[PDB]
Amino acid sequence: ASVLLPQLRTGWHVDQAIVTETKRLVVIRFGRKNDRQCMIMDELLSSIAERVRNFAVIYLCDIDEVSDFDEMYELTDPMTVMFFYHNKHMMCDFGTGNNNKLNFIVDDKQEMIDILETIFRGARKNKGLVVSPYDYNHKRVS
Amino acid sequence: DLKDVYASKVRLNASEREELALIEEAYDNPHDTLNRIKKYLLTQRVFKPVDITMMENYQNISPVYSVDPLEKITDAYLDQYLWYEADQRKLFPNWIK
């Protein structure tokens, strides 16, 4: 990570990065970037980024310089992953209980591509919430 | 013995379809197949590589040796023949199990 994955500098880079892309699916992340949990998600989202390039897209967002979106999206967390399509928050249903964002790490590349594909499906179908193919009940639920 | 594995699954993949195709051609042309088998036993000393998946029992693993289904025919017929002749001529004493 921090090579292929563009790192958004400030809240203006976050906002503008979300607003610019109508066609692709904006995937923003937020993490202390020194933390193991968000680091794993980064090194996953590098290869995942290369695979989902054509449709989805990945953007690195630390919470260091940006405290803005924490008050908005209720972010503290070790890490969070946010999704946006047509400048609209894409709600993702896992078995964690948090439909808005996913705070949990996934270890399978093909899986991450599967959930990005899924939220892309519901996204184009315009549905606000899409049901993830997997559960993640007992996995993390942090 | 080679079709024992494929009688179950309703959905065959490519390699399985190649093997089953070879076997069906072996039923259709036994003379051409048997002559193809005797030819390999007398001649070829050089064979194609073997890709290996791992059998995983969680107690211990390895191996699974997956042979090109063409050579699998010759090895199967040769095996059956050696067991028929060996058990006919009592090569293996009774104590071998």
């Binding site: 049901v131 193919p133 | 594995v5 191996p63 699974v64």
Partner: protein
């Protein structure tokens, strides 16, 4: 089960819905009386017993073999009955027919025992073979004794919603397997996510099937949320079950069922009228959310009386000894309260009782009269019950009413049908695909096959009912490709039995097909046999057990072959024939040489359809031209080619003429409807009145993009609310001003005949 499993009295009891009433069979199982899921240990036989058993059955087998050698007779299977299943190996694998080749197979124990390194998938049955040894375990008793171990099939079903699928009993129902749908849709270009979420279907089918006992207050004991726009209470949250239930209740099916049942009762009362001494039957205008609003209720049907009524104490739809002198009421009200129950709440009678008492007695729920009947239906279990104040004459006709509604209701069959589509349950019908316009595209695969028509096997002619005499029958089976016609001549004396003529005609006809196909060699042996009528498929298969390789196809196409006895010489040789005679006609000769077999069969089908529809005309076209002659061995009126074109066109004009003149429809239609008219029409498939009304209920309001004032009850509140959609179903049939006032015009007709005693 490998473990100790006790079945509490919690899930045992099974209830049954009968026309005589509702019956309940309760567990009452305590202490010494209990049921237990049988472990395998009771079934699998111990080794030592199996080996002593083995040497015993091999010894007795050797003795019986020696005796059979003494008397010079081969060992019989059924004389060798007793133990066919005992020994290692089993005596069955001595009498298996492949014993020769498998006997030429050696080294198999070490081969398969050593096979784990060749293959990938793990099957730990390696320690034996089914061929050389046998079936070393019989679990067929386990299934039967687990079925019997739980309450019987009926008790297994009570935990399911099968009752809601609306079948009288399980007979021909079949399932679509998990790998069935997963493999069915597996073939397509799909992303891995589409593959997984698309493979998440089977456990949704399973979740829905056992959903009544899967979703239960006793099980979850947690927050209870009501599913949107429905009457279901979901204990806990099951993401699969929620999507399945929404899918079943799609497009306001709940309120369609409520309004439909209420409208049913209204349509019945509009005939009940004076017979029940009714002043008026008025369907109230109710808020749409009331149907699925369980908190509060209201009277669905207000019933106004001519005179005062004597109503009895609150009772049940099926009861006895009801004294109606208890109370007097001017007004009556019906309430339809629908519920989707689980296994614990399965009882409809107690529910409707307690709820009736609640709504009538207390809180917000308002009724125009203190006396009324609350009707209710449990959709999952398809149960129905009515609890309330009854008056003389009402109860029996409401029993027949609810019986008719449960038997056939449009909305209820929409529910049952959507449930069947959710569970992939289907009635048996026929395994082999029917022959319709689509399959008729290819009747020639180069695979030889026959057409069988038994319609004419039994013929009795009547003149002016003064004279009824039997006619020699026939069995009509043709092969289009070769053109040959196998026609059997049945003799009248064969019917001297004169008992079960229909049952005998079918078996006797199937006999001819059997002996016929058996008479044909391997080359001409038909791969398929298409029966015109759908009866013979049951008789034939019995005779087809001999050669399994040949498939029987019943045709929805209605073939003219029933009228094949109309041809002049073909009918003459049958009457002139005496005894049963299997005769070979060549019905394709001239144009078998001239034109292709398919064209031959289409034009012959045309001639026989015209000949069936109008006999005299079709004969008039053939014998009309004096110049043409009918040769003896040709049997058809041999023409030139263009003449065949004209004659066939005239036969078409005959079929369309008598068709449109009889069924009185102008002939334009379309080319496709023209085809299906000449040949089949898919057995003239018409969706019935039911299927029409239900096709209306299924269809969504085509274009999504009046207002009624209503008083509604929020939580601990009463609020006037403007409503929408359809509350507008109204009965008002024989009553008020409209029907009687319109009926008044006919009153001058009542004085045409005037008489007094």
């Amino acid at each position: 089960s490998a473990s100790h499993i006790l079945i509490p009295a919690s899930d045992l009891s099974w209830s049954k819905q009968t026309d005589t009433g509702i019956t309940h069979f309760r567990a009452g199982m305590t202490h010494e009386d209990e049921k237990l899921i049988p472990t395998i240990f009771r079934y699998i036989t111990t080794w030592e017993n199996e080996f002593l058993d083995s040497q015993r059955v091999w010894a007795e087998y050797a003795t019986k073999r020696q005796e059979a050698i003494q008397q010079n007779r081969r060992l019989a299977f059924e004389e060798l009955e007793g133990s066919w299943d005992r020994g290692i190996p089993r005596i069955s694998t001595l009498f298996q027919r492949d014993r020769h080749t498998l006997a030429y197979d050696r080294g198999h124990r070490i081969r398969r025992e050593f096979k784990q390194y060749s293959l990938e998938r793990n099957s730990p049955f390696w320690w034996t073979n089914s061929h050389h040894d046998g079936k070393l375990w019989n679990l067929n008793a386990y299934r039967t004794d687990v079925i019997q171990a739980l309450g019987g099939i009926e008790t297994i079903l009570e935990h399911t919603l099968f009752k809601g699928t609306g079948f009288n009993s399980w007979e021909g129902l079949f399932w679509e397997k998990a790998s069935g749908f997963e493999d069915s849709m597996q073939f397509k270009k799909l992303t891995h996510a589409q593959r997984t979420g698309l493979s998440q279907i089977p456990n949704r089918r399973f979740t829905l099937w056992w959903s009544p006992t899967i979703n239960r207050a006793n099980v979850y004991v947690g927050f209870l949320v009501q599913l949107d726009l429905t009457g279901i209470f979901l204990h806990g949250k099951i993401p699969t079950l929620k999507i399945s239930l929404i899918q079943i209740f799609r497009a306001h099916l709940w309120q369609k069922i409520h309004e439909s049942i209420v409208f049913d009762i209204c349509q019945i009362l509009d005939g009940e009228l004076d017979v029940l001494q009714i002043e008026s039957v008025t369907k109230e205008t109710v808020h749409p959310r009331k149907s699925y609003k369980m908190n509060s209720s209201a009277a669905d049907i207000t019933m106004e009386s001519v005179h005062e009524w004597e109503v009895s104490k609150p009772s049940l739809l099926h009861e006895t000894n009801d004294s109606f002198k208890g109370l007097i009421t001017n007004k009556m009200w019906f309430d339809v309260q629908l519920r989707y129950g689980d296994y614990d709440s399965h009882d409809i009678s107690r529910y409707v009782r307690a709820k009736f008492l609640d709504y009538t007695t207390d809180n917000v729920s308002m009724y125009p009269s203190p006396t009324g009947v609350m009707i209710g239906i449990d959709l999952a279990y398809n149960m129905y019950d009515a609890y309330g104040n009854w008056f003389n004459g009402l109860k029996p006709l409401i029993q027949n009413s609810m019986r008719t509604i449960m038997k056939a209701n449009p909305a209820l069959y929409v529910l049952r049908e959507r449930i069947r589509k959710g569970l992939q349950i289907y009635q048996s019908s026929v395994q082999e695909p029917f022959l319709n316009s689509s399959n008729y595209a290819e009747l020639f695969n180069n695979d030889i096959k026959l057409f069988v028509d038994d319609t004419n096997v039994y013929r009795v002619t009547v003149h002016k009912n003064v004279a009824t005499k039997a006619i020699n029958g026939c069995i009509f089976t043709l092969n289009p490709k070769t053109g040959h016609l196998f026609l059997k001549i049945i003799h009248t004396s064969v019917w001297a039995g004169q008992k079960r003529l229909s049952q005998l005609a079918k078996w006797k006809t199937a006999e001819e097909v059997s002996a016929l196909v058996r008479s044909l060699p391997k080359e001409e042996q038909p791969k398929q046999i298409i029966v015109t009528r759908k009866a013979m498929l049951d008789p034939l298969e019995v005779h087809m057990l001999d050669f399994p390789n040949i498939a029987i196809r019943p045709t929805e196409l209605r073939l003219p072959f029933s009228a094949a006895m109309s041809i002049d010489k073909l009918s003459d040789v049958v009457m002139k024939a005496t005894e049963p005679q299997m005769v070979l006609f060549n019905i394709y000769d001239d144009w078998l040489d001239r034109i292709s077999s398919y064209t031959a069969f289409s034009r012959l089908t045309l001639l026989l359809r015209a000949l069936k529809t109008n006999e005299e005309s079709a004969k008039m076209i053939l014998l009309s031209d004096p110049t043409i002659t009918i040769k003896s061995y040709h049997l058809w009126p041999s023409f030139t080619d263009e003449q065949w074109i004209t004659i066939e066109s005239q036969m078409r004009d005959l079929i369309l003429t008598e068709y449109g003149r009889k069924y009185n429809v102008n002939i334009s239609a379309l080319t496709q409807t023209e085809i299906k008219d000449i040949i089949l029409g898919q057995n003239i498939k018409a969706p019935s009145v039911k299927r029409q009304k239900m096709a209306e209920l299924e269809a969504a309001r085509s274009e999504k993009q009046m207002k009624t004032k209503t008083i509604n009850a929020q939580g601990e509140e009463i609020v006037v609310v403007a409503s929408a959609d359809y509350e507008s179903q109204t009965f008002s049939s024989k009553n008020e001003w409209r029907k009687s006032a319109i009926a008044n015009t006919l009153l001058y007709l009542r004085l045409k005949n005037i008489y007094v005693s």
